Amino acid sequence: SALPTIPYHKLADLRYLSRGASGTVSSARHADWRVQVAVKHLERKDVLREAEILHKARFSYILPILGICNEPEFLGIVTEYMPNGSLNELLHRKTEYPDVAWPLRFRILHEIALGVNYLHNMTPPLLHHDLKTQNILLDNEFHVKIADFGLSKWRASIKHDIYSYAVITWEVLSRKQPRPVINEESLPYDIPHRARMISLIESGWAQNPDERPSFLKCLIELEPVLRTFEEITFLEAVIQLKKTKL
Amino acid sequence: SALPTIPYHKLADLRYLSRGASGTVSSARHADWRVQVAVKHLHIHTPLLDSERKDVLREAEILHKARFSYILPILGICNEPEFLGIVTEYMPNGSLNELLHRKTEYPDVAWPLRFRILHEIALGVNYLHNMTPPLLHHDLKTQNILLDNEFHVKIADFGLSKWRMMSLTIIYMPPENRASIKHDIYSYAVITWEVLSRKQPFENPLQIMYSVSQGHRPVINEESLPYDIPHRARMISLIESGWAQNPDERPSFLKCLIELEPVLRTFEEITFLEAVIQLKKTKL
Amino acid sequence: AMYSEEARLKSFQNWPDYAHLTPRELASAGLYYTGIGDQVQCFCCGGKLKNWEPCDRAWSEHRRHFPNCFFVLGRN
Ligand SMILES: [Zn+2]
């Protein structure tokens, strides 16, 4: 509803990016704009509802929708691109990725916490149920965007999302595919404020939903940790990463 | 097709930034969401006349209808009985107005980013005319264009933007003064020249009315136009076509993007990341 | 003294500005503030409530979590 509609002939450089659960993401350059948008397609009603949802929630930490492709031969949804890809490439592949700095992963966690906080702080609120490290999207400078709302249901509440945030926190501090054990080998003692993170991860995936953290409490207890760092390391660790790529 | 509203009790920490044409720019920290969120407001706790109420309502509606990743998104509004203010997202690094007009804070800014942000703004404005009927921003300047942490630039302040209909600073006017789409091209050219030059045009404004309309342009001098910057003549041609006297020959934004593309082919993202540090530390 | 609403109001001192529920709303809900953080509890059960839901009201969450309230039973 009230979203722009563009024809499929305005797309060029059809290149494969990823195959999402709710539909594949194609790296297709536009024609009038000439930018490698993330066209989503293969379900037609499902992707229409997806476009409606992305139009409903609009935050800088969610990739802004740009229009829809209403054509009989092919239906598509246009969003921005991802040059460095998702977190899966950053963490699960360490053969050529040598190291990832602590400030980067902590900033990623803070961004995810804020995004799902707002996602739970709408009128009426929303639940994700599809928050995974592969779903987290890194921009040109690794800022977090959240996509694939297919399992996001309009509204067990505030449980799957916070559990996903906890497991992804442990994942990006451990860089190991997944209850996960939190020993020193997985979580070395060099991590600043380590015991805080251990308490966080055990709280997040608690069996009892009653004690399950809310995202608001998560962000209000995590803020001093990101307060400890500075912008210099934030802007330098990405440079070190890119230099190590070549 | 619905824009959620924001109660005033949730928002906190109103901080003064500036006063624009469509409101008074301010920054705030949204307490409930734990997000720093900027705001703008014509008046504070005054009888809300229906004229400005309709103005801000249509502003919010047009911002919500067509949102681009290269324009600043809209968060919401406060429909208070006595106070009116637009709640929009806060990009931490701010805008280019002080960035391009503070020599002490920014003695030097690298030309790779200086041209890459031009690509971003060109993409945004080209999209802004792709939605039927084409939108004429009418107020696109260095203030409206604003950047986030990583200097990704977004435009805002659509308040005086007027949609094009077919039913047939005062120094920022184009020689056109009938709404013409080429005013966006003219604004893009002047901001393109302002980015690299870091010089404010019109530096008595009464003569500008008879000067810019007749054909006069801000002075061209070697100190502000040095040959050291590569592709200097290309951007000279781009701007001289941008602010032409009439809309017949000014290139479409696609043509300007195509012309600028070879200029931007001379950079790598590693250069951009290296160049953000110098600017981020010289402003300290 | 905790029965009096003024007692809850004065126990709601130093309440943080980021809370989504005004002390008056909690006092009407029959809750008080311990003084530490955002911990609140009702005089009927004593159950301590945390992890504020921004859109949920105190009455609704007290009813959902603890439907055995004598305060809610009188309210209903
Ligand atoms: Zn109770």
Numbering used by the authors:
A (entry chain B): 8 to 49, 59 to 171, 206 to 228, 247 to 314
B (entry chain A): 8 to 175, 189 to 197, 205 to 230, 234 to 314
C (entry chain C): 159 to 234
According to the publication:
RIPK2 is an essential adaptor for NOD signalling and its kinase domain is a drug target for NOD-related diseases, such as inflammatory bowel disease. RIPK2 is an adaptor protein, which comprises a kinase and a caspase activation and recruitment domain (CARD) connected by a disordered intermediate loop. Among the IAPs, the X-chromosome-linked inhibitor of apoptosis, XIAP (also known as inhibitor of apoptosis protein 3 [IAP3] and baculoviral IAP repeat-containing protein 4 [BIRC4]) is thought to be the most critical ubiquitin ligase in the NOD2-RIPK2 signalling pathway. XIAP binds to the kinase domain of RIPK2 through its BIR2 domain.
Here, we present the structure of RIPK2 kinase bound to the BIR2 domain of XIAP determined by single-particle cryo-electron microscopy (SPA cryo-EM) at a nominal resolution of 3.15 Å. The final model of the complex corresponds to a mass of 84 kD, with a 2:1 stoichiometry, in agreement with both native MS and translational diffusion measurements by NMR. The structure shows that XIAP BIR2 binds at the RIPK2 dimer interface, interacting with the C-lobe of one kinase molecule (Kinase_A) and the N-lobe of the other one (Kinase_B). XIAP BIR2 uses loop 176–178 to mainly interact with Kinase_A and loop 209–214 to interact with Kinase_B. The XIAP BIR2 loop 209–214 makes electrostatic interactions with the C-lobe of Kinase_B, which comprises residues belonging to the αH-helix (E279, S282, and K285) and to the regulatory region (K209 and I208). In particular, the two RIPK2 patches suggested to be part of the interaction, the R36/R41 basic patch and the regulatory region comprising K209, which are 40 Å apart in the monomer, are in fact close to each other in the dimer because of the antiparallel kinase arrangement. Moreover, considering the RIPK2–XIAP BIR2 structure together with our biochemical and previously published observations, we confirm that K209 is critical for RIPK2 ubiquitination most likely because it contributes to the RIPK2–XIAP BIR2 interaction interface.
